[PDB]
């Protein structure tokens, strides 16, 4: 499973994305219900953003609130009320660390 992104909305986008497949403990990239999730606020959660950005759609958020989102992408934890799958979790997944 490869990725790509190009643009910073494209990052997030994606983040929001991949992490879902996090949340619900998936290994692949799963799309987010922004349908569902615009419909209806109590799908997924989100939490651990930055200050000054709530839980909404990048769309919303300019380059800069992008940037923290990003930045706190770590921070960020969906919540998905719905049952797991079945898939061991992967808290963390580590790497080489820029300073």
């Given at each position: 499973g490869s990725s790509g992104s190009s643009g910073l909305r494209e990052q997030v986008q994606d983040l929001f994305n991949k992490k879902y497949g996090e949340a619900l403990g998936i290994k692949y990239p799963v799309q987010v219900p922004y349908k569902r999730i615009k419909?209806?606020?109590?799908?997924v959660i989100i939490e651990?953003?930055?200050?000054?950005?709530?839980?909404?759609?990048?769309?919303?958020?300019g380059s800069q609130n992008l940037e923290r989102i990003l930045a706190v992408a770590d921070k960020i934890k969906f919540t998905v009320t719905r049952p797991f799958q079945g898939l061991i979790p992967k808290p963390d997944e580590s790497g080489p660390s820029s300073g």
């Amino acid at each position: 499973g490869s990725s790509g992104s190009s643009g910073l909305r494209e990052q997030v986008q994606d983040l929001f994305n991949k992490k879902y497949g996090e949340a619900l403990g998936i290994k692949y990239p799963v799309q987010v219900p922004y349908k569902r999730i615009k419909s209806n606020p109590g799908s997924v959660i989100i939490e651990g953003l930055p200050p000054g950005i709530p839980f909404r759609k990048p769309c919303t958020f300019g380059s800069q609130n992008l940037e923290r989102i990003l930045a706190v992408a770590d921070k960020i934890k969906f919540t998905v009320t719905r049952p797991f799958q079945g898939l061991i979790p992967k808290p963390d997944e580590s790497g080489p660390s820029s300073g």
